[PDB]
Amino acid sequence: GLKVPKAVQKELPFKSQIHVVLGGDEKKARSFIQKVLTISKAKDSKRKEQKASQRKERLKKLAKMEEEKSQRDKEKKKEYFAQN
Amino acid sequence: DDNMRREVQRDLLLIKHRAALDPKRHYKKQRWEVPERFAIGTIIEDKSEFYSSRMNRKERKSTILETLMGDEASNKYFKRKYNEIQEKST
Amino acid sequence: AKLVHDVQKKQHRERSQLTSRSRYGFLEKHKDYVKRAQDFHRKQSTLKVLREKAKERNPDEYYHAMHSRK
Amino acid sequence: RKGQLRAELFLNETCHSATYLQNEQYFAVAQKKYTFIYDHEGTELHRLKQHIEARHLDFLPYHYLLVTA
Amino acid sequence: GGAKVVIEPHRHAGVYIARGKEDLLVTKNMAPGESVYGEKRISVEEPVPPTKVEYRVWNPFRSKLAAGIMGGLDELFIAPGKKVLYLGAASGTSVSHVSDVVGPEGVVYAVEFSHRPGRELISMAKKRPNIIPIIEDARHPQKYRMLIGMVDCVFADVAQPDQARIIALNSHMFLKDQGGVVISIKANCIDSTVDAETVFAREVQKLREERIKPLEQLTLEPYERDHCIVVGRYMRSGLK
Amino acid sequence: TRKFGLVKRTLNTKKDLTRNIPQVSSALFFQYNQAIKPPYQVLIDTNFINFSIQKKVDIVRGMMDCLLAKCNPLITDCVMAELEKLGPKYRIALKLARDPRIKRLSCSHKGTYADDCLVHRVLQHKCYIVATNDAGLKQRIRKIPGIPLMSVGGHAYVIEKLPDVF
Amino acid sequence: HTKRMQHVFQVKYSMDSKYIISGSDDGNVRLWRSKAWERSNVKTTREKN
Amino acid sequence: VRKLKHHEQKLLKKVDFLEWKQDQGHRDTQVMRTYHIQNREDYHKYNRICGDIRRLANKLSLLPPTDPFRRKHEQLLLDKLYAMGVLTTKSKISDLENKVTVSAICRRRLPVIMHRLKMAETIQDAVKFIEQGHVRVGPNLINDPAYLVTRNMEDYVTWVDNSKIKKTLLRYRNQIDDFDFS
Amino acid sequence: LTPKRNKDNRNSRVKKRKKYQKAQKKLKSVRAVYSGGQSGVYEGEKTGIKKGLTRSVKFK
Amino acid sequence: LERMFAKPFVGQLGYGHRDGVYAIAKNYGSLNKLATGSADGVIKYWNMS
Ligand SMILES: [Zn+2]
């Protein structure tokens, strides 16, 4: 964890300062909902990182193909200004 | 309101979390924040519909959470996935 | 693979941590080192900006929340 | 006629004379030097850069002309 | 067939979503304690003494308007205030849902030509008040001009290949200005020779030459093959 | 009772979810458009008619010889607006647009921008085959996925994006 | 005048003195109002006055 | 005044009761709301000074580039505007037309530098404090918010002692010494 | 010294059978193609319904 | 106001003729119809409502 010294955490500006239950079916159902919640959370985190790693290769492929198309267009306007 | 929200505070959260309740569906993506006006209610069955999709008398669990608690194969899937999640997160 | 073979670009398995020194196991390699070192750089950078705020505290720092905070 | 406060303002400098513009909705006050015109509820709308002082205002109502001297 | 499902208002007023595990589309019944068609009803209890009110599941495989709804239309004109002229109302398949999405205040003039679906339609119509059964041919709106007055949306589920003349004559006679027009087009019943969106283009052009400006169309493909829901409005003044 | 920090109040100079993504067509395969088949409906426009006359290629027999099917040339009245507004140097194009083979549509949009009317009533339907000769209109059309378009060149029409041209 | 009308050959006046029918040489026959600023609906008597 | 109809809006376009041409976009009103200027005419008694120094820099640029009167008075004026803190660097004489602003000569006022060095938290609260008489610059107390400071006196802007806001912040940090009477 | 080739590419018909099979299942995602109608009894569309989304083409 | 309301063109009628209108005759006993003949040979009887 982020550990700070006491000599610098006791001396800081104000705004930038690091500032009954049932036994049984109720609590087992609450842990059941906790189970399905962490299931859903790990699942769609997997989904979102998969999408981000997909748009990684999308960005790289698009970047190299726009690079070569931009150089082809620049040699096109180069020869167009060369045929003056 | 917050007088029956104790009874229905779970089931709307799992309906929000329908995407991983059963590993055979993949409902399409929407956030579905809890709406301001809604109402629970049960299906009633067509009188010619019989032997096919009617749930029996002693099979009618009076809550969707109890009906989901019903089948231990679904709960077995919950158990095995939560166990592999627990051992991979510890 | 432009003009190379699969046996030209095959694989290079990594050696594991030794068994003599196995009490403090898991020899860490270059990707583990950069994974540790960028985190340590991040923690040192936020410590530096905290020390800078501290020595530029300006002790006339008044708000209205210093009757709930103590 | 009915007692109705529309705009009541104490502005610190001296005011020689003032008038309404076309309705109760706008009134121009000839202040210490600059002539100001005001909305119905007392907000100011224009500090006239011209009319470098004023003593007598009038309003030609069909011409919509605020005249100052 | 006995589980519990929550209700939620849709974008269009009057129609409701029933979100459960799967999520149905549903409407609020006019005639409680009964199912006309053979659909499933979801009954809720409002808590005063407590009332028991029921909601009929709208089957998109059996009614083209419910196909268009959950295929996604940007707007209908079947609002819970309006009046609806249902051209080609065969049975209580869709007209019951259009009736109780209109509600207890407004009328659905349902027309029909054939006699056996007409008589089971009037036997349906005795049980909910707000629909008006007509047993006339739709080609002659003159012979039922006596009894429908200035409807503000028309729906057309007629399936005979003079649809444009049908909807043109009926909309000229009874549809009020800036009023809604919803068409279900069936390409195999207009003409089987040429292809589906060619006949959709023909019928869209016949609409806008009959100065019904078309705003929107939909293919409703995962439910039925080769139909199109065209929504337009009767411009009647300034088509441009 | 008097308030602190008052300003002469002036006028505040400043302070006084149905998404729609259009679904791809039922007629469309990946880029094939499996539901155009003879007989075709060919939208026409102004530079196409002018270029066709100055290349002396007939309209209906030119389309039949280019495409080997019955073609129904279709002129929007908004493009006949432009072909009228070109002036008296194109009266030949006008009285060849007035032709009972060339059945004409009816538009509904203010003004007479025929290129936007063409691209709109194409991408509503994807059943038409566009005849044109405009470069920018050609670029709009070959940007939208999978309609065919034709253009006069040499001394016959050529057809670009249609599979069963032979 | 309009840009699309050309060599206008036969112009006649409709029988209620309100519209001007202009048949040109480019084919089209057009309608015009005579009083080009008035409009052709019934008017309440304050508008008429 | 009525959100006029289409023909009325066409028949009079140039009407605008709210914003005339000679308001110059209401910039005096806008910047006095921005910097919470109490009195009227303070913008224009700043703008007279801004126009005055660009007039004098105009005349000094007009004077030829060799004589010591011109070069001494231009470096003298540049150092005087640095010493009043209107600038921030001793920059070129082109910044005597790009950089002198009525917003800058407002930005050296007392409540805005008070909010700048976080003594208050908003400039309205700063005018509240120095109208209640809590602050001083060096020895002498400040009662009016029109006192703009110099480059020298951005360091001794401190409250007076027995100012109970000073007492409450010291007792917040519980460094409240009370032998020094505050 | 060849790369790893493919039994799929060995038969010039089969790869066109086994990539038409994919192109069937690809445009299950692009559009919502018809499938055969109401297969069982209608027990819901089994995959969700959303409100703020209309997939219907508008006319300019 | 009349210079900003002078919008005189009503609309044409039909898709126009083929070659160019050379003869037009209103009927002198009814309002909303007139006959129109164009010099390719084609004559029509327009309803103007
Ligand atoms: Zn058009």
Curated annotation (Swiss-Prot), chain D:
It is found in: Nucleus, Nucleolus. Present with 5800 molecules/cell in log phase SD medium. Interacts with snoRNA U3. Interacts with MPP10. Component of the ribosomal small subunit (SSU) processome composed of at least 40 protein subunits and snoRNA U3. Involved in nucleolar processing of pre-18S ribosomal RNA. This is U3 small nucleolar RNA-associated protein 7. It comes from Saccharomyces cerevisiae (strain ATCC 204508 / S288c).
UniProtKB/Swiss-Prot annotation, chain E:
Coiled coil: none annotated. GO terms for cellular component: 90S preribosome; box C/D methylation guide snoRNP complex; nucleolus; nucleoplasm; small-subunit processome. The keyword Cytoplasm does not apply. It is an enzyme of class 2 (transferase). There is a cross-link at residue 64 (Glycyl lysine isopeptide (Lys-Gly) (interchain with G-Cter in ubiquitin)). Methylated by HMT1, forming asymmetric dimethylarginines (DMA) within a domain referred to as an RGG box, made up of repeated Gly-Gly dipeptides interspersed with Arg and aromatic residues. Belongs to the methyltransferase superfamily. Fibrillarin family. Component of box C/D small nucleolar ribonucleoprotein (snoRNP) particles that contain SNU13, NOP1, SIK1/NOP56 and NOP58, plus a guide RNA. Interacts with snoRNA U3. Interacts with MPP10, NOP58, SIK1 and SOF1. Component of the ribosomal small subunit (SSU) processome composed of at least 40 protein subunits and snoRNA U3. This is rRNA 2'-O-methyltransferase fibrillarin. It comes from Saccharomyces cerevisiae (strain ATCC 204508 / S288c) (Baker's yeast). The lineage of its organism: Eukaryota, Fungi, Dikarya, Ascomycota, Saccharomycotina. The chain holds residues 82 to 326 of 327 of the full protein.
From Swiss-Prot, chain G:
Disulfide bonds: none annotated. WD repeats lie at residues 3-42. It is found in: Nucleus, Nucleolus. Interacts with snoRNA U3. Interacts with NOP1 and MPP10. Component of the ribosomal small subunit (SSU) processome composed of at least 40 protein subunits and snoRNA U3. Belongs to the WD repeat DCAF13/WDSOF1 family. Required for ribosomal RNA processing. Present with 6620 molecules/cell in log phase SD medium. This is Protein SOF1. It comes from Saccharomyces cerevisiae (strain ATCC 204508 / S288c). The gene is SOF1. The chain holds residues 344 to 392 of 489 of the full protein.
From Swiss-Prot, chain H:
Component of a heterotrimeric complex containing IMP3, IMP4 and MPP10. Interacts with MPP10. Component of the ribosomal small subunit (SSU) processome composed of at least 40 protein subunits and snoRNA U3. GO terms for molecular function: RNA folding chaperone; rRNA binding; snoRNA binding. PROSITE patterns: S4 (PS50889). The keyword Secreted does not apply. Required for the early cleavages at sites A0, A1 and A2 during 18S ribosomal pre-RNA processing. One of its GO terms (cellular component) is Mpp10 complex. Keywords: Nucleus, Ribonucleoprotein, Ribosome biogenesis, RNA-binding, rRNA processing, rRNA-binding. It is found in: Nucleus, Nucleolus. This is U3 small nucleolar ribonucleoprotein protein IMP3. It comes from the Eukaryota. InterPro entries: Ribosomal_uS4 (IPR022801), Ribosomal_uS4_N (IPR001912), S4_RNA-bd (IPR002942), S4_RNA-bd_sf (IPR036986). The gene is IMP3.
